[PDB]
């Protein structure tokens, strides 16, 4: 009966940002102030709505996207931004209606000597469209010389590992991010706040 936000925010494993996760939320009651009442979040920013107003709204579906990035990239998880993440990994639309929530996960996602399991896309021939996802691993070709499937001078594997170490500066520490997007359709509204 309650929307399963605990399973999203409290998941044991989080995806790499290039292969970001998405859960569809529907047919449930969502207590958002449950979320924003917690001081646990270093970012909790909504666009086109208020945290409180949400409990008084309804929606066709809610999507919860989630992934890990660097602290200093959290600012790219926002409408209108550019940079490696916004351009090549996870792109919100200019008119994003939703909330972006994040928290430092250095204690779970860093490892002595480096956690290299979290990856990002470093090279892409064009920028992602909003909510587009690219998990391909084709060699990226700079300049004119075909790669023919081989890494080399002008040919690079397109994903690079963050390699998080507990001792990084905070800007380079891992953050877990959840993006909530609120879908209004010409169809039945199945996700509502406790005020409706």
């Amino acid at each position, epitope marked *: 009966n309650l929307c399963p936000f605990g399973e999203v925010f409290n998941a044991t494993r989080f995806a790499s940002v290039y292969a970001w996760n998405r859960k569809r939320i529907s047919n449930c009651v969502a207590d958002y102030s449950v979320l924003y009442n917690s001081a646990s979040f270093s970012t909790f920013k909504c666009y086109g709505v208020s945290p409180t107003k949400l409990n008084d709204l309804c929606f066709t579906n809610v999507y919860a996207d989630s992934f890990v990035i660097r602290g*200093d990239e959290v600012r790219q998880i926002a409408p209108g931004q*550019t*940079g*490696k993440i916004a*351009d090549y990994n996870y792109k919100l639309p200019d008119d994003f209606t939703g909330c972006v929530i994040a928290w430092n996960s250095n204690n779970l996602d860093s490892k002595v000597g480096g956690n290299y399991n979290y990856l990002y896309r*470093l*090279f892409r*021939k*064009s920028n992602l469209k909003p909510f587009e996802r690219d998990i391909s691993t084709e060699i990226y070709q*700079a*300049g*004119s*010389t075909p790669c023919n499937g081989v890494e*080399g*001078f*002008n040919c*690079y594997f397109p994903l*690079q590992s963050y390699g998080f170490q507990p001792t990084n500066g905070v*800007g380079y520490q891992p953050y877990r991010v959840v993006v909530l997007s609120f879908e209004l359709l010409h169809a039945p509204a199945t996700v509502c706040g406790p005020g409706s």
Partner: antibody, heavy 117, light 110 residues
């Protein structure tokens, strides 16, 4: 701890030849493409030539094609540039650099080549 | 064909500056951009790769950004020791090796 130590520059007359060397240490040389970039006095940077980690693929700017040959000796961590048919306009500081993620991430401090009569 | 940079830039100590690099869809628009710093008398040093990534040891007051056909290097907290020629570089779909812009001489005004 990475070092790229160049040598072999000097003064030659037009039509002469020179062989530059770049001695690499402090990284896994054979895993990286390597490149030469030159800079004429008071001018900008010009990519010259590059070579794959194994040495089995080489790349050249049009300005030096047919005159310069890049090679490497992975048993000695040494990168070479053989320069034949030298012209006044090849006068420059020649840098070797390691290639990393589409960029030149470590550069030697250069060796000066003067082509003059 | 060519990457174009303004020949000079300046700011006063502790302020910011932005250095631009203009090209075309077939180079800057399609390929990762790098930035290099060359203090006179020394070799170029990589500041920015893959448009906006810093190698280890480059402080976060250097940052890179890119528009459709232009790239930009921003330098905050200017110091005198930032006096140098700054070069953008990228690849072009028609050439085997990278291009460099003509360089921008930065002077922190004294």
């Amino acid at each position: 701890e990475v070092q790229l130590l160049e040598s072999g520059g000097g003064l030659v007359q037009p039509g002469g030849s020179l062989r530059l060397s770049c001695a690499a240490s402090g990284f896994t040389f054979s895993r990286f493409a390597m490149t030469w970039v030159r800079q004429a006095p008071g001018k900008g940077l010009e990519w010259v030539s590059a070579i794959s980690g194994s040495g089995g693929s080489t790349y050249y700017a049009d300005s030096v094609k047919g005159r310069f040959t890049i090679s490497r000796d992975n048993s000695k961590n040494t990168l070479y540039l053989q320069m034949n048919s030298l012209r006044a306009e090849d006068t420059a500081v020649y840098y070797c650099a390691k290639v990393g993620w589409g960029a030149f991430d470590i550069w030697g401090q250069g060796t000066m080549v003067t082509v003059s009569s | 064909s060519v990457l174009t940079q303004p020949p000079s830039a300046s700011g006063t100590p502790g302020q910011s500056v932005s250095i631009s690099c203009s090209g075309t869809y077939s180079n800057i628009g399609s390929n990762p951009v790098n930035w290099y710093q060359q203090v006179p008398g020394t070799a170029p040093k990589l500041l920015i790769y893959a448009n906006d990534q810093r190698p280890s040891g480059v402080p976060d007051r250097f940052s890179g950004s890119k528009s459709a056909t232009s790239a930009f290097l921003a330098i905050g907290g200017l110091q005198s020791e930032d006096d140098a020629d700054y070069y953008c570089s990228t690849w072009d779909d028609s050439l085997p090796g990278p291009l460099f812009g003509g360089g921008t001489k930065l002077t922190v005004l004294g």
